[PDB]
RNA sequence: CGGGAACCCAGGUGGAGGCCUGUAGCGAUGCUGACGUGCAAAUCGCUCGUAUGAUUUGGGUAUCGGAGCGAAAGACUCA
RNA sequence: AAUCCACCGGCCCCGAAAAUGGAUGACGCU
RNA sequence: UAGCAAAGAUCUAACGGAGACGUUGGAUACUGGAGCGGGGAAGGAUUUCGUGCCAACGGCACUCG
RNA sequence: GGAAGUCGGCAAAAUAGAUGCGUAAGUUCGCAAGAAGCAUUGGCUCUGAGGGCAA
RNA sequence: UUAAUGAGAUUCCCUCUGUCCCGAGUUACUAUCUAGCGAAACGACAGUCAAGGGAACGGACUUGAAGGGCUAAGCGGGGA
RNA sequence: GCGACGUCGCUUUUUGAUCCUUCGAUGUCGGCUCUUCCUAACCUAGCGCCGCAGAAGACGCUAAGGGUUGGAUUGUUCACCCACUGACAGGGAACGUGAGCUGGGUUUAGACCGUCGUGAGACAGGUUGGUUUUACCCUACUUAGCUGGAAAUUGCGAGAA
RNA sequence: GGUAUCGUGAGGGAAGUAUGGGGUAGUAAACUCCCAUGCCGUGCCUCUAGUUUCUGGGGUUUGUCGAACGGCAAGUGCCCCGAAGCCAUCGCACGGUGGUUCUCGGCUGAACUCUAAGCCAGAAGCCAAUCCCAAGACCAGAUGCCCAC
RNA sequence: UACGUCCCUCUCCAAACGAGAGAACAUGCAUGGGCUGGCAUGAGCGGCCUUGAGGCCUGAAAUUUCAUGCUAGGGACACA
């Protein structure tokens, strides 16, 4: 895990950078979060979340499923001291265990999500 | 049923103004008589902050790898002039002083500390102690209590003050001398005065007290904010937008019983300007003065020539002219507030607190801006003879 | 060890700028660097570096 | 009127309407805003309803106490 | 040269516990 | 003590005065022609005007009202 | 990030003028409708027409 | 049953946002201090607690525990 | 591990009584917010013990120290699912908490409906719309000062960690 | 006596806590550690972010000073950028200590076993300590300086 | 008449007001220069871009070093 700034509270619509059909990733809840009071579960760059697809194919829509954040539109300060961020939120849609599930990513997957998911980096056009 | 973890820390009550700005070690380390007599504290002045780049160690994931940007603090540390020696009895009501030998000379900044005007005064402070020291009964009544600091004493504390005429900083508006007792943590108290008696009336510079890669504890007084409300002082919560009589409050500050407000509920009052300690602040460089080494911030991988002082000084402090100390991270001061270093309490035996350090880069880019230039002789290289100097370096 | 800026070609000493990964492609570098948020806010607006008096390329056009 | 053995396709004209936006006017929905020892024995702010009308308003003039008057709330009839 | 098989009787051990701090009335007494 | 917090910010000279006050000049403003405008009805009836005055009344003050 | 706040989008934002293009469901054919929805707006020098007074 | 109309009641969606996660900074005006002015509601006396008993949830009683005095700004627990 | 049969102590966020306090007024549930407290331990923490080989559960004791979530529908408490989590334990504090907020439910005066009633009207039936004042006083707390003080302001009264 | 400085510290407060990982080790599984993260706490402003009455610099809009220059009015016109300061689990730093006992494994054996006396041992626990406050705990703590009468 | 403290002024690590940290011929204050940093090419002019990263702002609730300018010492107790 990393000291990534949190960007995607529960109820955020991330879009799908994975050629599996979906378009949105309404964040249902962050997998791994330990509850705190009145605190909205906030996803981060490497975090795996649970999602419902709000736009895309119906064969995956009305269903709770998993996703790993690819890209974060919120600037997190890398520990090397380089504050970096993206055009757009993005998340792959993933196996409940954690696996790629979907055609290799159409976006620059970030470092904080590749070395926490050895199955994403092998499908991502660039790492940044 | 439902609840949350309690707001703020009850072990910093009362949230009260510290009784002096001078940071003062409440407790000095445990006396290990297996060590050498030494000085376990030192007063520095918070210049400001900056950040540096470090070659990392301690194999982990973010470590044993490429460098890291870690924020640091620059604490200007002029040498301290020891004036006295103070010994304590170990009596059943807690330590009590058993006398205080002074030096024969006592710097004119030290004697200001026993005044509040000093310029309409007649400067009689330590007049009958300079005179009576040159006597013979003086030498008697001085070795009569040094021969006491071995019979009755257990804790031996020199009295050091700061050199401020040696601190050409003006924004430190004070010309008194900050006076601080400093524990000696050697062994065999007989040989503990021997140190004290020796370095008395001699300047003690900070590297004599501390070493480079080891950590201290920073007794200091927080930046004050006056009367802060409940949401800022304790960080409780804001009531909803809809609230009447406003929303920056604690709604319920008491049940029916007890029918008194508790000391635990949050209320508005002094925030900041409290005495804090900041255990385990790790020194990264304890570099000497520009008067002796005008290449402070150039270690091995910045072969350029520069100093700690950023472009345009530290904001609100000035230039660092003395034996600065570079800690790691935050220090509970505003600029030009005296900090007291202290050798730490913790066991400190760890691969995260006892590891040595090399600094591959330090930033002298100006605090006042954004700064894109280190070492202003790089700024001149970016630009050209623009019209400011062109109207002077071409008008002759 | 100072990665030079993207839109104004400043020198960015480590820990000052704020890098940026556009949702696009680049064989050169996928991450863009900006010293000041002025340099970036004026890049989503997407001026050109030339035609801006304080950038660096302007100081290859207005200098000759 | 243009244009084609029925009366449709369009072009203008004109300026209707308990029509619309909106100023005054007249109202008072929301903030359950601000005041609540008021500015005020009911006000203030913003929002808001209507604004050619079954409209608003002046003066005069009618109808009042077991009564009057009421598009009716037992409303109003000098707090 | 003592040692048993069953029970009667408590003082006393557990059975038994709450929520402001805490009451033989207080200290204290053994 | 609560308060004297909605609605226009007075600034200056030299003059007067027993003294923050007034007057004049200059300055910057505000009302902004559904007006802090000029006229009337209803109502009030000397509030008009001038010269004084300054006790208490003008919720501060006043040389002014 | 975007109603997860809250009894409740309360409040605030947002929308916005003009012009051009389009504009469904339903329907008492009048409407709905400013539907929705897009699109263009500056400054400048121009070039067009648009009219009263006779051989 | 219904087109239109609705400061009507209701639900969703879109947009939008400090409603919120989670708050932060700024601004007038106040509060604050001052000069001038100056009320009132209210008022037995008052006025630290715990426990006991008690018209059974005490400010006074009982037994303990705190308490030097006078103070300015707050707050809203109590003074049923 | 409890279960026949059974019983016997102690239990209040219990179902009701009682009518003792309050009728010249203890302002109504729920929330928000915040603090506290208890253990009958939900989690972590400590061994214990089994048909407890590892794994992994299994039973138990000790501990109040720390921790115990985010949502959808509901005014709700409760309930229910959703999802996270080490787990989302159970309680008190005047059913903690309106001179703190909110005003959704109770909530009257308007109105509609259902049943009832000859009718006016009734319903602890439904629906909609519907005041939320005052701290400037004492203490509590919170910070902020000042000044006296040892026969705790007095005797000279005398006690030095 | 005053005034001044340095301490003492009775007493009160009190806080750090979870989770994953690597490690040796599919080992008649964990455990000093190594590594992060999260929450809480206390700080901080180097960076990043927010904030702008530096109304800083610029741009622009209606009105307006005869017009530029320059301004001004729009209770800060609007807009872009903006240092300083403040501030964010939006940034950052830091928060791993000694005894004492009971559960308990157990020792000696009496009158064979842990306890009847003699006893080690240790998780929490409590207790101090670090930490915050500080003699109305009235400091015969130490110390600087000094009167008139 | 003592040592001293306090007020007035100034400073600002402090601050609602007190209190605090200070200074009291000092780099103290005020200007200017320089640095540092914001902005983004100034009125005017030559041939619209050129002068030109120009002009302006930069410590002020209070960035940093250099040159010149002025620069209360009076009160109140202590004190009898
Ligand atoms: Mg309200
Ligand atoms: Mg209107
Ligand atoms: Mg008439
Ligand atoms: Mg959206
Ligand atoms: Mg009365
Ligand atoms: Mg008080
Ligand atoms: Mg008070
Ligand atoms: Mg309630
Ligand atoms: Mg909710
Ligand atoms: Mg009080
Ligand atoms: Mg202590
Ligand atoms: Mg203690
Ligand atoms: Mg000031
Ligand atoms: Mg002082
Ligand atoms: Mg200057
Ligand atoms: Mg100054």
From TrEMBL, chain A:
GO terms for biological process: translation. GO terms for molecular function: large ribosomal subunit rRNA binding; structural constituent of ribosome. Pfam families: Ribosomal_L14. InterPro entries: Ribosomal_uL14, Ribosomal_uL14_CS, Ribosomal_uL14_sf. The keyword Transferase does not apply. PROSITE patterns: RIBOSOMAL_L14. Keywords: Ribonucleoprotein, Ribosomal protein. GO terms for cellular component: cytosolic large ribosomal subunit. The keyword Ribonucleoprotein applies. Belongs to the universal ribosomal protein uL14 family. NCBIfam families: PRK08571.1. PANTHER family: 50S/60S RIBOSOMAL PROTEIN L14/L23, LARGE RIBOSOMAL SUBUNIT PROTEIN UL14. This is 60S ribosomal protein L23, putative.
């Amino acid at each position: 895990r990393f000291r990534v700034s949190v960007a995607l509270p529960v109820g955020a619509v991330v879009n799908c950078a994975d050629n599996t059909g979906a378009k949105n990733l309404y964040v249902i809840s962050v997998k791994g979060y330990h509850g705190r009071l009145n605190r909205l579960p906030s996803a981060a760059l490497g975090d795996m979340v649970m999602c419902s697809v709000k736009k895309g194919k119906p064969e995956l829509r009305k269903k709770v499923l998993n996703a790993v954040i690819i890209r974060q539109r919120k600037s997190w300060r890398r520990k090397d001291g380089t504050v970096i961020y993206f055009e757009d939120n993005a998340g792959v849609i993933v196996n409940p265990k954690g696996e790629m599930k979907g055609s290799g990513i159409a976006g620059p997957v970030a470092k904080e999500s590749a070395d926490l998911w050895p199955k994403i980096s092998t499908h991502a056009p660039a790492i940044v | 049923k439902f609840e949350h973890p309690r707001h703020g820390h009850l072990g910093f009550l009362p949230r009260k103004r510290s009784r002096q700005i001078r940071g003062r070690a409440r407790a000095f380390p445990k006396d290990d008589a297996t060590q050498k007599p030494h000085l376990t504290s030192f007063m520095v002045f918070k210049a400001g902050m900056t950040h540096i780049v470090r070659d990392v160690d301690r194999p982990g994931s973010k470590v044993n790898k490429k460098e890291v940007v870690e924020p640091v603090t620059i604490l200007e540390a002029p040498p301290m002039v020891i004036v006295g020696i103070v010994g304590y009895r170990q009596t059943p009501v807690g330590l009590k002083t058993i006398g205080t030998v002074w030096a024969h000379h006592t710097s004119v900044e030290f004697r200001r500390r026993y005044y509040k005007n000093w310029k309409q005064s007649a400067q009689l402070a330590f007049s009958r102690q300079k005179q009576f020291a040159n006597t013979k009964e003086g030498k008697v009544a001085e070795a009569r209590t040094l021969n006491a600091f071995a019979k009755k004493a257990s804790v031996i504390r020199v009295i050091a003050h700061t050199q401020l005429r040696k601190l050409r900083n003006h924004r430190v508006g004070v010309k008194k001398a900050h006076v601080q007792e400093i524990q000696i943590n050697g062994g065999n108290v007989a040989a503990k005065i021997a140190l004290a008696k020796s370095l008395l009336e001699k300047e003690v510079r900070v590297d004599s007290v501390f070493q480079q890669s080891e950590a201290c504890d920073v007794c200091s007084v927080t930046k004050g904010h006056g009367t802060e409300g409940v949401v800022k002082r304790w960080g409780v919560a804001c009531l909803p937008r809809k609230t009447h009589r406003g929303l920056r409050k604690v709604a319920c500050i008491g049940a029916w019983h007890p029918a008194r407000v508790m000391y635990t509920v949050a209320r508005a009052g002094q925030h900041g300007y409290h005495h804090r300690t900041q255990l385990n602040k790790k020194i990264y460089q304890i570099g000497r003065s520009v008067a002796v080494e005008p290449n402070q911030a150039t270690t091995t991988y910045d072969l350029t020539a520069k100093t700690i002082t950023p472009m345009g000084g530290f904001v609100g402090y000035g230039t660092v002219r003395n034996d600065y100390v570079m800690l790691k991270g935050s220090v509970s001061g505003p600029r030009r507030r005296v900090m007291t270093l202290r050798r730490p309490m913790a066991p400190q035996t760890s691969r995260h607190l006892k590891e040595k350090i090399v600094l591959k880069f330090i930033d002298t880019s100006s605090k006042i801006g954004h700064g894109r230039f280190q070492t202003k002789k790089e700024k001149n290289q970016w630009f050209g003879p623009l019209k400011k100097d062109r109207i002077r370096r071409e008008e002759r | 060890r100072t990665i030079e800026c993207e839109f104004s070609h400043f020198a960015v000493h480590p820990g000052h700028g704020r890098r940026y990964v556009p949702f696009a492609f680049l064989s050169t570098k996928p991450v863009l660097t900006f010293s000041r948020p002025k340099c970036f806010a004026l890049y989503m607006r997407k001026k050109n570096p030339r035609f801006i008096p304080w950038t660096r390329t302007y100081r290859r056009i207005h200098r000759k």
